[PDB]
Amino acid sequence: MRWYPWLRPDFEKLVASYQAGRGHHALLIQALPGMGDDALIYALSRYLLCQQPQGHKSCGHCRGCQLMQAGTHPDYYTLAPEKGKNTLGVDAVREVTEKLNEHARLGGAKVVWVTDAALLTDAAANALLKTLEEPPAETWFFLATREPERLLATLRSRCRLHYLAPPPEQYAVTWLSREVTMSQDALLAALRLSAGSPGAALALFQGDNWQARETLCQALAYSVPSGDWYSLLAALNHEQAPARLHWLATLLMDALKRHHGAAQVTNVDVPGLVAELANHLSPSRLQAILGDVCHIREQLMSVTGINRELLITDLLLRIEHYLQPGVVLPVPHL
Amino acid sequence: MIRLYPEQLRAQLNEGLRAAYLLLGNDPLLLQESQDAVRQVAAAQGFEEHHTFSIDPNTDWNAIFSLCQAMSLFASRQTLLLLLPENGPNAAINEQLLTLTGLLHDDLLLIVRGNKLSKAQENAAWFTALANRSVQVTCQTPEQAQLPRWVAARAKQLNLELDDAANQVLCYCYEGNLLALAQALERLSLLWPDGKLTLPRVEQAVNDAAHFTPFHWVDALLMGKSKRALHILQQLRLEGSEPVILLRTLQRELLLLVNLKRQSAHTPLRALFDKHRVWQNRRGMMGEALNRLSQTQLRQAVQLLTRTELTLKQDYGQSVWAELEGLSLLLCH
Amino acid sequence: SYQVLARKWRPQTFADVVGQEHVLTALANGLSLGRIHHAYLFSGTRGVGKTSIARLLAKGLNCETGITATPCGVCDNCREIEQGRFVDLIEIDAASRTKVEDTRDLLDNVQYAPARGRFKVYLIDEVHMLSRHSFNALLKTLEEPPEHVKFLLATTDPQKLPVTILSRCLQFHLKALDVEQIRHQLEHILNEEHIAHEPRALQLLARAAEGSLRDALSLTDQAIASGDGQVSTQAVSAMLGTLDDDQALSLVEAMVEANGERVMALINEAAARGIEWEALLVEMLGLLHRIAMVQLSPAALGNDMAAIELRMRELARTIPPTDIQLYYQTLLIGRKELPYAPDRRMGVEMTLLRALAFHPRM
Amino acid sequence: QVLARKWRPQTFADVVGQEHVLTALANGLSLGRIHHAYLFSGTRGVGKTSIARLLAKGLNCETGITATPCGVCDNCREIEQGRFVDLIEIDAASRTKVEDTRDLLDNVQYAPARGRFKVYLIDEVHMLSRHSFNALLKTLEEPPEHVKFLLATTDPQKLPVTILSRCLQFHLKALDVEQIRHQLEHILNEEHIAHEPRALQLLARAAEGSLRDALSLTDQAIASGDGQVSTQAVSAMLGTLDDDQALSLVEAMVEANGERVMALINEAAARGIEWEALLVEMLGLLHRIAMVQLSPAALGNDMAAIELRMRELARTIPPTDIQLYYQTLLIGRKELPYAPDRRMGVEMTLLRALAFHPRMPLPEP
Amino acid sequence: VLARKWRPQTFADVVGQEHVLTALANGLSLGRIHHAYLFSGTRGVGKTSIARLLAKGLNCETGITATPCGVCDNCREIEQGRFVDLIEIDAASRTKVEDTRDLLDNVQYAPARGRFKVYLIDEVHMLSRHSFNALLKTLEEPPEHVKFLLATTDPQKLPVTILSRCLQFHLKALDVEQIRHQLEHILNEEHIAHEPRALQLLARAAEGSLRDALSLTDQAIASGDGQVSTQAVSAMLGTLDDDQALSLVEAMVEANGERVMALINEAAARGIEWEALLVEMLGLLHRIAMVQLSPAALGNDMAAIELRMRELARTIPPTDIQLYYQTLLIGRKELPYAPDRRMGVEMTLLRALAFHPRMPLPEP
DNA sequence: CTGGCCTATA
DNA sequence: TTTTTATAGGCCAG
Numbered sequence A: 001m002r003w004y005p006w007l008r009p010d011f012e013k014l015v016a017s018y019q020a021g022r023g024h025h026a027l028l029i030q031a032l033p034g035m036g037d038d039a040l041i042y043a044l045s046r047y048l049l050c051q052q053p054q055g056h057k058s059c060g061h062c063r064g065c066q067l068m069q070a071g072t073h074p075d076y077y078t079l080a081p082e083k084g085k086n087t088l089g090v091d092a093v094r095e096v097t098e099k100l101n102e103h104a105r106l107g108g109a110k111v112v113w114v115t116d117a118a119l120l121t122d123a124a125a126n127a128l129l130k131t132l133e134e135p136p137a138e139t140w141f142f143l144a145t146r147e148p149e150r151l152l153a154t155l156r157s158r159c160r161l162h163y164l165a166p167p168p169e170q171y172a173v174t175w176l177s178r179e180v181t182m183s184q185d186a187l188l189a190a191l192r193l194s195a196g197s198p199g200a201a202l203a204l205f206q207g208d209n210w211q212a213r214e215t216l217c218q219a220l221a222y223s224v225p226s227g228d229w230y231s232l233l234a235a236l237n238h239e240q241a242p243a244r245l246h247w248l249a250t251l252l253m254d255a256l257k258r259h260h261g262a263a264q265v266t267n268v269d270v271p272g273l274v275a276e277l278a279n280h281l282s283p284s285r286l287q288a289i290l291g292d293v294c295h296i297r298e299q300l301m302s303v304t305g306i307n308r309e310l311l312i313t314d315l316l317l318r319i320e321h322y323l324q325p326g327v328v329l330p331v332p333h334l
Numbered sequence B: 001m002i003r004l005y006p007e008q009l010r011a012q013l014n015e016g017l018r019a020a021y022l023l024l025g026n027d028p029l030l031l032q033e034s035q036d037a038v039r040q041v042a043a044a045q046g047f048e049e050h051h052t053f054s055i056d057p058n059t060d061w062n063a064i065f066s067l068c069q070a071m072s073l074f075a076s077r078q079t080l081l082l083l084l085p086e087n088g089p090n091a092a093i094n095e096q097l098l099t100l101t102g103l104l105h106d107d108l109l110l111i112v113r114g115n116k117l118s119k120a121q122e123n124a125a126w127f128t129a130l131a132n133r134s135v136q137v138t139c140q141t142p143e144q145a146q147l148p149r150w151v152a153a154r155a156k157q158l159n160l161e162l163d164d165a166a167n168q169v170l171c172y173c174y175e176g177n178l179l180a181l182a183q184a185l186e187r188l189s190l191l192w193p194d195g196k197l198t199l200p201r202v203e204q205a206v207n208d209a210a211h212f213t214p215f216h217w218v219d220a221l222l223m224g225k226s227k228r229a230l231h232i233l234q235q236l237r238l239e240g241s242e243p244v245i246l247l248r249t250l251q252r253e254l255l256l257l258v259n260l261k262r263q264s265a266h267t268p269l270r271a272l273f274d275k276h277r278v279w280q281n282r283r284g285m286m287g288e289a290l291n292r293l294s295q296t297q298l299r300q301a302v303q304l305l306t307r308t309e310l311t312l313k314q315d316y317g318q319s320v321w322a323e324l325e326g327l328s329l330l331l332c333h
Numbered sequence C: 001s002y003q004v005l006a007r008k009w010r011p012q013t014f015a016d017v018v019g020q021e022h023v024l025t026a027l028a029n030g031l032s033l034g035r036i037h038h039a040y041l042f043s044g045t046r047g048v049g050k051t052s053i054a055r056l057l058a059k060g061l062n063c064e065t066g067i068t069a070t071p072c073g074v075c076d077n078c079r080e081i082e083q084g085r086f087v088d089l090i091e092i093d094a095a096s097r098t099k100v101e102d103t104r105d106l107l108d109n110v111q112y113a114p115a116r117g118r119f120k121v122y123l124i125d126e127v128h129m130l131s132r133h134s135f136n137a138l139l140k141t142l143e144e145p146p147e148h149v150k151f152l153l154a155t156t157d158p159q160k161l162p163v164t165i166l167s168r169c170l171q172f173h174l175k176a177l178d179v180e181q182i183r184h185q186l187e188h189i190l191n192e193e194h195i196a197h198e199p200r201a202l203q204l205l206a207r208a209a210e211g212s213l214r215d216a217l218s219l220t221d222q223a224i225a226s227g228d229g230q231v232s233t234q235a236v237s238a239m240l241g242t243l244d245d246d247q248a249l250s251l252v253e254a255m256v257e258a259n260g261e262r263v264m265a266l267i268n269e270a271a272a273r274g275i276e277w278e279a280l281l282v283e284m285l286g287l288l289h290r291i292a293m294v295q296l297s298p299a300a301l302g303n304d305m306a307a308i309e310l311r312m313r314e315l316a317r318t319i320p321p322t323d324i325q326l327y328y329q330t331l332l333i334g335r336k337e338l339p340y341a342p343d344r345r346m347g348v349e350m351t352l353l354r355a356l357a358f359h360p361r362m
Numbered sequence D: 001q002v003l004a005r006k007w008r009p010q011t012f013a014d015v016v017g018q019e020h021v022l023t024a025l026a027n028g029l030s031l032g033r034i035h036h037a038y039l040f041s042g043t044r045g046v047g048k049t050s051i052a053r054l055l056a057k058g059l060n061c062e063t064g065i066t067a068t069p070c071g072v073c074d075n076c077r078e079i080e081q082g083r084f085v086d087l088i089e090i091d092a093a094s095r096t097k098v099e100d101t102r103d104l105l106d107n108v109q110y111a112p113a114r115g116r117f118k119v120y121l122i123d124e125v126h127m128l129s130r131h132s133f134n135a136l137l138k139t140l141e142e143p144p145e146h147v148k149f150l151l152a153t154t155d156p157q158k159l160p161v162t163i164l165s166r167c168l169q170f171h172l173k174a175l176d177v178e179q180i181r182h183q184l185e186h187i188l189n190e191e192h193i194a195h196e197p198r199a200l201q202l203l204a205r206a207a208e209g210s211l212r213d214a215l216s217l218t219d220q221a222i223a224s225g226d227g228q229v230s231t232q233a234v235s236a237m238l239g240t241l242d243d244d245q246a247l248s249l250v251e252a253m254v255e256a257n258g259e260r261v262m263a264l265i266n267e268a269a270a271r272g273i274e275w276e277a278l279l280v281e282m283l284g285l286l287h288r289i290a291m292v293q294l295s296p297a298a299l300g301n302d303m304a305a306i307e308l309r310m311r312e313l314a315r316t317i318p319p320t321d322i323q324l325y326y327q328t329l330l331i332g333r334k335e336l337p338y339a340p341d342r343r344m345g346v347e348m349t350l351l352r353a354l355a356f357h358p359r360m361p362l363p364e365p
Numbered sequence E: 001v002l003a004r005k006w007r008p009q010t011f012a013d014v015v016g017q018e019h020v021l022t023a024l025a026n027g028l029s030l031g032r033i034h035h036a037y038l039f040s041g042t043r044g045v046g047k048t049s050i051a052r053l054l055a056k057g058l059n060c061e062t063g064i065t066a067t068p069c070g071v072c073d074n075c076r077e078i079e080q081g082r083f084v085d086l087i088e089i090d091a092a093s094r095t096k097v098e099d100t101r102d103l104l105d106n107v108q109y110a111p112a113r114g115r116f117k118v119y120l121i122d123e124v125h126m127l128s129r130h131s132f133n134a135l136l137k138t139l140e141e142p143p144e145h146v147k148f149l150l151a152t153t154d155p156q157k158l159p160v161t162i163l164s165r166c167l168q169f170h171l172k173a174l175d176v177e178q179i180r181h182q183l184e185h186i187l188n189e190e191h192i193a194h195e196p197r198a199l200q201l202l203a204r205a206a207e208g209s210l211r212d213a214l215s216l217t218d219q220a221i222a223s224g225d226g227q228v229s230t231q232a233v234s235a236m237l238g239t240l241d242d243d244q245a246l247s248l249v250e251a252m253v254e255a256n257g258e259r260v261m262a263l264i265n266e267a268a269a270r271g272i273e274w275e276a277l278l279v280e281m282l283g284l285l286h287r288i289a290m291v292q293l294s295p296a297a298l299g300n301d302m303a304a305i306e307l308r309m310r311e312l313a314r315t316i317p318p319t320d321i322q323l324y325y326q327t328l329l330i331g332r333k334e335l336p337y338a339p340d341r342r343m344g345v346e347m348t349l350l351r352a353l354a355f356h357p358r359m360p361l362p363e364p
Numbered sequence F: 001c002t003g004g005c006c007t008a009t010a
Numbered sequence G: 001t002t003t004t005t006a007t008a009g010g011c012c013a014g
């Protein structure tokens, strides 16, 4: 968990209200992944839990700050998911909501950091509702998501929103060039793949990840011309599939943009592979395929337990069918 | 080590008892019957004290120190039984056994129950130096092939006279549930003291009750026998199999078919089976399938499997069982 | 002793409640006529006064002054409820205590008479969360409680309750609060707090409330933080992501001219400007609507549009009714399906692209 | 006080409908053929919990096992006030466990303190664990002379076939619009409460077959309308508008005339009528109409004031067409959440009608 | 009650089930008594009834016989309820181990009136893991004077390790005629007026169970005031109809819009969940489209519904079936938006009717 | 009253 | 060679 420089102003604005004591007790921060929401919060958390605060700052030498520094501080609750899992269950919320009625074990303020509100189960989000509307005193909540609209109706209305907008592209590319050494085109693409957020960008270069995009592109550069798309299985069938499916999605879209002669593309760095999609695929099928590729991505992330190999395999065989002349193509519903 | 079929056992327990009786198998009936055939002939040889002991990896190193001690002379002859874990003899219990291999009396008779072993499990020292001393019985159930013989055999041991056609109609109803087939005869000899089991006679005294595994079903789809399939589903339901398990096993094979049917235009059939490590006995079956099914049927197969998986885990639907009844017929054209 | 407005300004006498005048009427009417039921169920979308009203009905039942419809707020009993300390208003977090084993405790302690109040009033809130088994346990008690017991149930979402539970309650469905209803209220509150504000900014906030007073009070509180003390038109409109009128239409236009390169390139300057995407989609739905309308009678275009009005009519005269319906339809579906696509941007791009390739018929 | 509860029938005379159940019980009591396990099933509010008690009351009346209990002898009044030592009303939904069913059983042997029969009436019986249904099995097949079981539930299917086979199943039917109205009237009269005749038709209808649902609805009609059950009050409360303005728009729409559609909506809009609400009364009218085509007698009893005009519409418009309008008004609903402004959404959905109108499409350029 | 009165006390008296009785009979006769019997099959087919006969024939004063006398002290003693050495355990309410351990502490003492201590354990599937283990220890080494009769609807639940120690007899569902015959017998003896077809309607409705049958009759007799008429039984079975969704499909294909909208009304009485009717319909259409691809696609399951189904399958067009199916599925997708879920199903069938291929809807 | 175990619903 | 997950209700041995 690292601290990025574009947080300063967003932090100085948010503390302020707290520094006056008129801070809202339930902040929902909406930020892309890697935008550094967790650090912005940690900073707000540490400031609330410090007994001898030097202005905005947490001191380091008070009992409160010591405990915080060493993981255990009785009044800081982390609501993330069980190690093996990817949802955030109700029972976990209930511990936290009960313990909250005990006078602060260290006679201070209590903070609850819900790491990703999106992961709250249906039952979990509701259990969180009544406490969240009117918690005990000197209780402070922090929730974070990508997309507040995916979040329970009624929970969203108990919170104050704060938007963590990402820095201008230009700043972000200049930021990046100093952390990785890659082509200018590369950065720009990573950055654009990642909806604007540096560091989520930067994340791509650090992993096995960027090597895997190149592999998706290698394969794609074969499937297109030849019409063998079942051949993508290999590059897509990984646990990171939702992510790579998104790569695939953005390529398809760039191709569609070129069929309309658009200026920006997302995959700036492979303008070769983009042009070759615009060449061997009609707009009609470019678009239909963009359709199913996102749609499966949702189901792969949303349906608990669903089998990837089977679902990706259906998609690939089904795409090949669309490729045929005269087949009936899909059209969004309702 | 004299290996045996449970039928042959009664005879080689008469000749001579041997220090170590090994009952490995999966079938509940052939286990019990063999088990008891020994216990019975051991009483009759002076044996009063019968001790049983189920072995989990749970049995401490204090539980196995009360077994090695469980044999000292001179006590009226005692019959020590041991039951086994899913896995068979782990590295923890591969050694405990070694302790018991050398304390063997005419006074202490060992009986051991469990599944078939892995090949380096059987070849683990203790078991081979048990070898010339021990009898070992195969209790694997007979399959749709080997079965009628086993019936027309037991039929005769009970001196009843079965018909080519009655033998068929028993093997249909009780496939994989030998214990029920066994009582099927017991029940028919009480019905008719003639001992003659004409077809129409046997028809009236039967009820349908086969046990299959999901495998039997994919096998049946693979070979295109559909009336078989359908039976196999409806039995697999009334046993309460998690339909998810059906899905995932029909898929290991249905996706494998997809992938072979493609490469089958480029490289020969025989090379592909090898490339993929296709168990030898499965290999004939597969080809049959690859031949009858189009590269498009296979695709609709895959799509349809998917719709039922989403319908199961997303929509919480009931359809699941009858969506497979349909998927089952599609793979049989 | 600070608290968010959303919390501070909870109506503490019937008088202080905005709208829902049909529920307030029936309630006060029965409290007076003597027609008091044993199980009221209150429903409606988030933050429209469901549980604020439960809490008020309770005051009206227990008030040291009499069973009233206009409770005072000045007895041990009304203050005590205002603060949650009141002992004969058992308030239950249904969404949290969902288990039967728990609501069976609830029931075992119903028979017992009230402490210092006149009625034991159970307030089960978020009630649609109780296990299936829990609902059914209430069945017999809800239908035939002790004379000293009242059950006040509230939930966003009554769909979910067994039809047997509904059968047994009076159901008051609270309407969503009218745009003006919300604004007047925002006005009143910002005045009492002594906080500066600009008329038209309250206008954006009532819209943005999307029918809900809490939603709205929570937005306002957000205004006061980002705005540095004031709720200005300037501030709100930057925080909400509101649109300067041109950019919206420009897109509508380029969209129906099948002009791909420009629609795309227009969205891109819009992504720079940091426009809220659901808001673009919505203004576009609004324009498509005007247009379709004016094709009906020339008169339906507003006084309000003067600046656009020249470009509007043309779109009306050129583009066939049929083809505008498909445009609107397509962008409607896109707004629905927006929050599912991998970026918000990417979803407007997929949506526009789709509608783009409509232009020619045959 | 509360109607729903006050008017629980106290004799078989007072029960609405359920002839096929009453006639059987009655024929059986005087015929002396009395089962030991009666099971009662049907939707919420149709009189199972109260028929069960009436049965009990008649089984135990000091005058003799009779189908007309006397409602006066200690035993009768005491069952009416629910404090009869020998009517054991078991809330199945709280005694769900086995260890609870087991206590009930243990005390079956012991005889009755005051009555002819110990009557266990297990209400909401579908809630009992699998474990405690089976507990019930042999005792429910072969009880002691002096025991009877009255089981009642909303859905029977949840019960093991082993139970079902063991008892008489009386399935109560839901009540007809007429039957509900007639009651709602009788009561409101008896309880001296002014009412407009239509407000009752309106109520009986929204009851969706359930006599409680009805009484619960009246209870709050009385409150909404202030001691009066008036038409304005009921339709207010029910989301219904009074019925002309809904139809008028349909008509105007089939007749392709735009001005009037749009005007009729502007007028809907000064009244602040609720938008989803409207689109519904219309699918509602469009249905009854397509309905009337099919079977003529089908048209309701509640739309007398409108029948002249409705009947007309069915005669003059092709069924293919009507399914079209419904269709369009339906997706129109499906869409409404997402459309920019609930009004605009309705307006826009009617414009889709017009643009795709069968007989007079809107003018192409 | 008829269910109770007419429980057979003699082997002669038992309906069908002949492949069990004959094997019992003969085994008694020829000295082959297993230490333990298990009786299975469905509700109300004679499981426990035969268990009790076996106990009589096993202990009769005349001696071990297939033709117990029903008259000697021991035989009326059992008929009655109180026979010292017939220990009938209601296993569903005595399932814990504590109780099974005690039941069996007395297994070892010799019997105090007859040849045999007979433990009759009924609804035996309910016993815990632990009570099974204990039961099993006593069937692995059965005393000589003891016999065990185990009865249950669901045998699939006893350990493999117990079924392996019980001769298990599976009782068959009784047949329409078999049940109709016994209906006639009984009604006659009680002296009660009945029409022929009224009975054939009862037996059909019983769904293979002689209890569901006598239970249906007692109720019949009531509705008809002491007479079992077709005018009355017909009525009361319409009260009790599972039926409406198969019936709507028959009615829909045949174009019968009165019968179609009447059945929808019969469904409102029963108090149906509407999305539920739709989905049962879709599900039949499916099931049928498959008995088009093979005969074997109809259930061991289906039986009562079955006859109608194969006929539905024959006399329909398979291109048509996917037509009705499309319309039904869509009506479902539409149903939560239709104004009244009733209206929704109504308008969905009405749509099925206007676009009926075979006999379409009259236009002005 | 716990920890092992089965089940039902979404 | 044999499998979705979150929440709930429940039975039992000791």
Ligand SMILES: Nc1ncnc2c1ncn2[C@@H]1O[C@H](COP(=O)(O)OP(=O)(O)O)[C@@H](O)[C@H]1O
Pocket (backbone or CB within 6 Å): C005, C006, C007, C008, C009, C010, C011, C016, C017, C018, C019, C020, C045, C046, C047, C048, C049, C050, C051, C052, C053, C213, C214, C217
């Ligand atoms: N009708 C109303 N009048 C005044 N304030 C309201 C109204 N509805 C909601 N509010 C505001 O919303 C806050 C929460 O209201 P609440 O009654 O809890 O809504 P809910 O129905 O969703 O529980 C209140 O504190 C009050 O500020």
Ligand SMILES: Nc1ncnc2c1ncn2[C@@H]1O[C@H](COP(=O)(O)OP(=O)(O)O)[C@@H](O)[C@H]1O
Pocket (backbone or CB within 6 Å): D003, D004, D005, D006, D007, D008, D009, D014, D015, D016, D017, D018, D043, D044, D045, D046, D047, D048, D049, D050, D051, D211, D212, D215
């Ligand atoms: N057949 C009926 N006759 C008269 N009132 C009825 C009838 N059915 C239901 N009610 C009304 O509903 C109230 C509760 O009915 P109840 O018998 O509990 O229905 P349930 O079958 O769902 O338990 C009664 O007090 C009565 O006013």
Ligand SMILES: Nc1ncnc2c1ncn2[C@@H]1O[C@H](COP(=O)(O)OP(=O)(O)O)[C@@H](O)[C@H]1O
Pocket (backbone or CB within 6 Å): E002, E003, E004, E005, E006, E007, E008, E013, E014, E015, E016, E017, E042, E043, E044, E045, E046, E047, E048, E049, E050, E210, E211, E214
């Ligand atoms: N084969 C049969 N012959 C005569 N009556 C039967 C038969 N089967 C069931 N019955 C009737 O059903 C009643 C209960 O039968 P029972 O044998 O207890 O069924 P179960 O198999 O479910 O224990 C008996 O009293 C008898 O009237």
Ligand code: BEF
Pocket (backbone or CB within 6 Å): A154, C044, C045, C046, C047, C048, C050, C051, C155, C156
């Ligand atoms: F936020 Be409310 F209780 F719907």
Ligand code: BEF
Pocket (backbone or CB within 6 Å): C164, C167, D043, D044, D045, D046, D048, D049, D154, D212
């Ligand atoms: F209100 Be009833 F018993 F469903």
Ligand code: BEF
Pocket (backbone or CB within 6 Å): D162, D165, E042, E043, E044, E045, E047, E048, E152, E153
């Ligand atoms: F007595 Be049975 F098993 F219904």
Ligand SMILES: [Mg+2]
Pocket (backbone or CB within 6 Å): C050, C051, C125
């Ligand atoms: Mg609330």
Ligand SMILES: [Mg+2]
Pocket (backbone or CB within 6 Å): D048, D049, D123
């Ligand atoms: Mg009731």
Ligand SMILES: [Mg+2]
Pocket (backbone or CB within 6 Å): E047, E048, E122, E123, E151
């Ligand atoms: Mg029985």
Ligand SMILES: [Zn+2]
Pocket (backbone or CB within 6 Å): A049, A050, A051, A052, A053, A058, A059, A060, A061, A062, A064, A065, A066
């Ligand atoms: Zn500090």
Ligand SMILES: [Zn+2]
Pocket (backbone or CB within 6 Å): C063, C064, C065, C071, C072, C073, C074, C075, C077, C078
């Ligand atoms: Zn007061």
Ligand SMILES: [Zn+2]
Pocket (backbone or CB within 6 Å): D060, D061, D062, D063, D069, D070, D071, D072, D073, D075, D076, D077
């Ligand atoms: Zn009386």
Ligand SMILES: [Zn+2]
Pocket (backbone or CB within 6 Å): E060, E061, E062, E068, E069, E070, E071, E072, E074, E075
């Ligand atoms: Zn005798």
